[PDB]
Amino acid sequence: EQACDICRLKKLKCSKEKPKCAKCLKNNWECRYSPKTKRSPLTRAHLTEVESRLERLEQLFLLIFPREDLDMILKMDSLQDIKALLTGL
Amino acid sequence: EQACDICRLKKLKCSKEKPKCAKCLKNNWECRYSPKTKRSPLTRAHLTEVESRLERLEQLFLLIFPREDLDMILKMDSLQDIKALLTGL
DNA sequence: ACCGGAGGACAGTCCTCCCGACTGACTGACGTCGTACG
DNA sequence: CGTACGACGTCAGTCAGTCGGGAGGACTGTCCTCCGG
Ligand SMILES: [Zn+2]
Ligand SMILES: [Zn+2]
Ligand SMILES: [Zn+2]
Numbered sequence: 001e002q003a004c005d006i007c008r009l010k011k012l013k014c015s016k017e018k019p020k021c022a023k024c025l026k027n028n029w030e031c032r033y034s035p036k037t038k039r040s041p042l043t044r045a046h047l048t049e050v051e052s053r054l055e056r057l058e059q060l061f062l063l064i065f066p067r068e069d070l071d072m073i074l075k076m077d078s079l080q081d082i083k084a085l086l087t088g089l
Numbered sequence: 090e091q092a093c094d095i096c097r098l099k100k101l102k103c104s105k106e107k108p109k110c111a112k113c114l115k116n117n118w119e120c121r122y123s124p125k126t127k128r129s130p131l132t133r134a135h136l137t138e139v140e141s142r143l144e145r146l147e148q149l150f151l152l153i154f155p156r157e158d159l160d161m162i163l164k165m166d167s168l169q170d171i172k173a174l175l176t177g178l
Numbered sequence: 179a180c181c182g183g184a185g186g187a188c189a190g191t192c193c194t195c196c197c198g199a200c201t202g203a204c205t206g207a208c209g210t211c212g213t214a215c216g
Numbered sequence: 217c218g219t220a221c222g223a224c225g226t227c228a229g230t231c232a233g234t235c236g237g238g239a240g241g242a243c244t245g246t247c248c249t250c251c252g253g
C-alpha cells in the first residue's frame with residue numbers, strides 16, 4: 001500500500017517495488033518509505049479526555065483572570081505572547 | 090430504528106410503534122422517543138482545534154503553577170475552596 | 179429482569195492517485211528596417 | 217533616389233509539465249440496537 005515519499009509529495013502512482021521504484025529509479029532519485037506519522041487517537045474517549053480538561057482549565061482560569069483574557073490565550077500561538085500575557089498580571 | 094427511552098434503558102427489543110409501543114402500552118408505561126442527543130463532532134480537525142486550545146492553556150498554567158499538583162486543584166469542585174487556595178499565590 | 183458486549187450500519191479518516199487547470203517555454207509567423215541594386 | 221528582398225526581432229499561440237483540489241475507497245472507530253447468560 002505505502003507510496004514512496006516523493007510519489008506522495010508529487011501525487012503520481014507509485015510502482016512501490018523493492019528497494020526503489022520506477023520514477024525514483026528512472027528519474028534518478030533516492031526513493032524512501034518514511035514511517036507513518038504518529039497522531040493522537042481519534043476516539044471518542046480521547047476527544048472527551050481532551051475536551052473535558054480543556055474545560056476545567058478554562059474554569060480555573062476564570063477564577064484568576066477575566067474572561068476577555070481567556071479568549072486571547074485560547075488563540076495565541078507564540079510562547080512570548082503567552083508569557084507576556086501573564087506578566088501584565 | 091430509534092428504540093424507546095425505556096426499551097433503551099432496559100435493553101430489550103423495541104416494537105417501535107408510535108405513540109405508545111409494545112411494553113410501554115402493556116405495562117401502561119410512560120413511552121418516550123427522546124431526541125437524538127448531541128456530541129461534538131468526532132473529526133480530526135476538531136480533535137486538533139481542541140488540542141491546540143488545551144496546549145495553550147496548558148502552557149499558561151505551567152507559568153501560573155510552576156509547582157505541582159495542578160491536578161490536585163483541577164479535581165476540586167468548590168469555588169470558595171479553590172479561591173481560598175489560590176490566594177496562596 | 180438486568181446489563182456486558184456482539185453485531186452491524188454508519189460517520190469520518192487518511193491514504194494513494196487520477197484528472198483538470200494554469201503557467202511557462204518554445205516555435206512560427208508577420209512586420210519593420212536596412213542594405214543593395216537598378 | 218526609390219523599390220524590393222532578406223534578415224532579425226517581437227508577439228502570439230500551442231503544447232507540455234507541474235502543483236493542487238480532491239475522488240476513490242479501505243479502514244478505524246462510533247454508537248446504536250437488543251441478544252442471551
Ligand atoms: Zn514511488
Ligand atoms: Zn520512489
Ligand atoms: Zn419501546
Ligand SMILES: [Zn+2]
Nearest residue numbers: 093110113120
Ligand atoms: Zn416505549
